[PDB]
Amino acid sequence: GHMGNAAAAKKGSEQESVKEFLAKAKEEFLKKWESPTAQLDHFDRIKTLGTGSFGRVMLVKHKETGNHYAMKILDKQKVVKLKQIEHTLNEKRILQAVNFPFLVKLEFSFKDNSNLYMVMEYVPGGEMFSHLRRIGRFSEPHARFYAAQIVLTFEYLHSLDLIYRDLKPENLLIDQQGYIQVTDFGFAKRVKGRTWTLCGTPEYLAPEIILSKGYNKAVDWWALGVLIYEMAAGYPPFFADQPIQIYEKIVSGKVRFPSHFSSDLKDLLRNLLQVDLTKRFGNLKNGVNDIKNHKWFATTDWIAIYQRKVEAPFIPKFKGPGDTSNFDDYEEEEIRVSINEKCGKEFTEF
């Protein structure tokens, strides 16, 4: 067969140890899920790091300790108008309960008359998006290093019956050691089987979302295919100026590859960017192992990636704990807090 005796036994034992790890991780998650912390004037607001639909993320400095954090600010009225109440509750509840080396850590959460706040660890290396647009494309080994971290992160999340639903370079930060931090749990959800909400980012949507199916966690494996393609090409596989044209390309499923892609990479991508759910990697009997054991990942030491012992391909320049040089500038808007409580009943659980 492909593996000799020693290699097959080593791989089998490794896979059983993953199962043992995941069983413990589920116990820990459920304890936090069942039995889960600051206020605004505890922080100085420094600078906007990024924006989004419901609000913005700001660099803040904690007054007492002097530690820096990234504070996501959501306007309650805007969340209600966009029917994102349950999504925002999901985001905070899930972030509070997970624990994995490549998932951003939530340190505090609170609300006031106008806004919801989530205070997370500040990741100063900037968005993968910026680095990718600046360099053009990542070489295959560089893309593979990041991809491996996503594979492990999705193996963890899916084992907990969590679906992520917004993978893209904009949501992946580079930490001081060159490893990835996944941010933005706005569409994350506990899903045992099917779910139905039409949400995500156009270029990354699986066909079954666009086609209004009751879809499953395999949408995240499709999105991994999009990410790997974009990292290695510099642009995503279904690329057009307007969402409607993007969707038409996705549903056709036709993918063309740059001539510099290796055959191993093309084979992996055809198996992730697979319309037919009975054939998509990550959705078969062998589960995540079809991905982890694929030839494109043959050089990947999965345990060493988890342990953060692989030398990263790129280390951001670090210029102090509150430095923001790896982020773009955004228009600043003062944080207005009404004297009247808004949407109290909708957000009681936050």
Partner: peptide
């Protein structure tokens, strides 16, 4: 031709 800037999430498809 396609989108090179930051891409916003969508909450529905009309």
């Amino acid at each position: 031709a396609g989108r090179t800037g930051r891409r916003q999430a969508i909450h529905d498809i009309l």
